[PDB]
From a paper:
csDUF512 was crystallized under anoxic conditions in the presence of AzaSAM, and its structure was determined to a resolution of 1.68 Å. AzaSAM is a SAM analog containing a nitrogen atom in place of SAM’s sulfur atom, and it has been used as a SAM surrogate in several structural studies.19,42,43csDUF512 is composed of three domains (topology diagram in Figure S5A), the first of which (residues 1–80) is a PDZ domain. Of note, csDUF512 is the first structurally characterized RS enzyme with a PDZ domain. The second domain (residues 81–266) of csDUF512 has an unusually short and incomplete β3α4 TIM barrel core. Interestingly, csDUF512 lacks the starting strand (β1) in its RS domain. Instead, a short strand (β5) from the PDZ domain precedes the cluster-loop. Cys87, Cys91, and Cys94 coordinate the FeS cluster of csDUF512. Notably, an aspartate (D112) residue in the middle of a DDD motif located on the cluster loop is observed to coordinate the unique iron of the FeS cluster. The AzaSAM in the csDUF512 structure shows a very different binding pose compared to SAM in the Mmp10 structure.21 Some of the canonical motifs for SAM binding, such as a Glu residue interacting with the ribose moiety of SAM and the GXIXGXXE motif, are not observed. After rotation, the adenosine moiety remains in the same position, but the methyl group of AzaSAM is significantly closer to the cobalt ion.
Cobalamin (Cbl)-dependent radical S-adenosylmethionine (SAM) enzymes constitute a large subclass of radical SAM (RS) enzymes that use Cbl to catalyze various types of reactions, the most common of which are methylations. X-ray crystal structures of [name]-containing proteins from [name] and Pyrococcus furiosus show unique architectural features and confirm the presence of a C-terminal Cbl-binding domain like that of Mmp10. We have uncovered the “Unknown Function” of the [name] domain, which is to bind the biological cofactor Cbl.
Residue numbers in the entry: 1 to 443
């Protein structure tokens, strides 16, 4: 049951303590690590005594203080009996299947249900998990378990995921709830398949498990232009987004009356498509779903409103902000707020159409360098170009220059040379935009 180490994350605890690829993980707090479920339980602790066998045979005993939810930074080889490295689905909407061919290999990995995704707490369909796995999760009180539900209608879920076990999800969630496990849930909403009365059923079934099921996020199906031969979806438009938002509002009103929270939320893209006003900050209850596209517009507006009073009024600067279709109106309004506060901050916002993936793709993080270059050829860029960090692969801050990459594998430095401008990377929530402008403007 010794576990060969395959990867050590830059900046991690394991790296600090000189754990390396090819070392072996032997035990944590005197317990063997049988698989990823044991591992997740054992690292939920502020103190770990870790036994490592080095590749050269040395035995190390490490004393490790850490935050309870802090990761060690190691990935290790799967056991013969373990959570799989891949999903067991063929979702009708699978985002991997609608990638164009020829991109970097890691983009095609069907790893959203993998052992490493489970460890990170991503949304899981659980179709590749055995009942014994669920029972061990309960016994270990591994919580929360975040679940891609889509529908609690068993036959409908089998049809959406193409896995013969996929109808088990509601019985499995009931088991988790009865075991005291907390769950956050997601639905990918496909008009004519799992919306309307089907989403009503899903909402009702999930709320029956409150407070173990803590909330439900509903996101719209998104497509690229590369769906030849794949299932043909109807997309939400302004009419049907407004209809779905109105339908779900009946449930949100019920839940606000009962428990003081909306429980189910539709993601920001629904409000953009519907041209509907973004809810106030209280609706988002601490903004814990930002990485799932829920509450990002409102927190962005909040961060600009809060921080613009910190913009120096004595400086001058020029900036070009790069964004996509869904965010353009919000970024434009932030630029107007900034320029109203100090009109010597010359800011233009440049919307990039997603010709690479197809213009049905609209969120800012899917903009490629190729499209930025092509669509700024006839622009007079400001001294600094600012992009949001969602346009780069995760880890860019600590990464080597060659590893700060857009989805088309152009690096941040290469794009800067192409644009003949220094490029600044800002937090996609807007938290540091004013600060970056202050630091790059002249008195
Ligand atoms: C929803 C989503 C999708 C949908 C997109 C549908 C659509 N309409 O485009 C789907 C599922 C199709 C999708 C697919 C992919 N996605 Co995706 N997706 C997301 C997600 C979870 C939320 C995006 C969202 O809904 N935003 C809502 C809209 C309204 O806001 P926005 O456009 O994002 O803009 C806001 C902020 O970014 C900010 N902002 C925007 N521009 C600017 C500019 C400046 C200067 C500033 C200050 C702020 C700012 O303010 C806006 C709000 O006011 C993001 C996560 C994230 N943190 O962004 C990942 C994310 C964009 N996806 C990512 C990835 C990797 C992919 C895939 C490549 C995965 C794959 N292996 O195939 C695919 C590619 C396409 C495909 N194969 O279908 C990565 C991209 C990172 C990168 N660039 O390398 C992200 C960032 C998640 C991650 N893992 O880091 N995705
Ligand atoms: C949004 N992605 C993960 C979240 C993202 N990595 C983040 O920032 O947290 C991918 C997930 O979106 C869902 N998904 C897959 N295909 C589509 C699609 N075509 N449209 C919308 N959601 C999809 C699946 O649950 C998939 O695991
Ligand atoms: S679970 Fe579905 S969306 Fe995720 S990789 Fe597997 S088939 Fe694609």
């Amino acid at each position: 049951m010794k576990k060969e180490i395959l990867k050590v994350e830059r900046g991690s605890i394991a790296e600090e303590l000189e754990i390396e690829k090819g070392d072996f993980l032997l035990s944590i707090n005197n317990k063997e690590v049988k698989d990823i479920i044991d591992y997740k339980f054992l690292v939920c602790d502020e103190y770990l005594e870790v036994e490592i066998e080095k590749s050269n045979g040395e035995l190390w005993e490490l004393e490790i203080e850490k935050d309870y939810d802090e990761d060690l930074g190691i990935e290790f080889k799967a056991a013969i009996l373990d959570v799989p490295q891949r999903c067991h689905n063929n979702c009708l909407f699978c985002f991997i299947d609608q990638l164009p061919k020829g991109m970097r290999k890691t983009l095609y990995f069907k790893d959203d249900d993998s052992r490493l995704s489970f460890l990170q707490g991503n949304f899981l369909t659980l179709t590749n998990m055995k009942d014994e796995d669920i029972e061990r999760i309960i016994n270990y009180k591994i919580s929360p378990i975040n679940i891609s539900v889509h529908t609690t209608n068993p036959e409908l879920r089998v049809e959406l995921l193409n896995n013969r076990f996929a109808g088990n999800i509601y019985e499995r969630m009931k088991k988790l709830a009865e075991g005291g496990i907390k769950m956050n849930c997601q639905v990918v909403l496909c008009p004519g398949l799992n919306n309307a009365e089907e989403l009503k059923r899903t909402i009702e079934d999930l709320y029956a498990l409150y407070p173990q099921v803590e909330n439900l996020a509903v996101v719209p199906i998104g497509v690229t232009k590369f769906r030849e031969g794949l299932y043909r979806f109807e997309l939400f438009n302004k009419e049907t987004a407004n209809k779905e938002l109105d339908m779900v509002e009946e449930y949100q009103n019920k839940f606000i009356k009962e428990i003081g929270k909306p429980f189910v939320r539709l993601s920001d893209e629904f409000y953009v498509i519907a041209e509907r006003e973004i809810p106030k900050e209280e609706f988002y209850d601490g903004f814990h779903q930002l990485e799932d596209g829920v509450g990002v517009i409102r927190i962005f507006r909040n961060n600009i409103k809060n921080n613009v009073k910190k913009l120096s009024t004595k400086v001058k600067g020029s900036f070009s902000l790069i964004t996509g279709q869904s965010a353009y109106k919000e970024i434009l309004e932030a630029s107007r707020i900034i320029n109203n506060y100090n009109n010597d901050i010359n800011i233009e916002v440049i919307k990039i159409d997603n010709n690479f993936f197809g213009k049905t793709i609209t969120v800012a993080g899917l903009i490629t360098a190729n499209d930025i270059i092509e669509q700024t050829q006839e622009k007079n860029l400001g001294k600094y170009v600012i992009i949001p960090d969602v346009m780069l692969r995760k880890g860019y801050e600590l990464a080597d220059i060659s590893e700060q990459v857009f989805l088309d594998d152009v690096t941040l430095k290469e794009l800067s040379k192409s644009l003949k401008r220094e490029i600044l990377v800002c937090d996609y929530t807007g938290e540091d935009l004013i600060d970056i402008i202050n630091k790059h403007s002249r008195e």
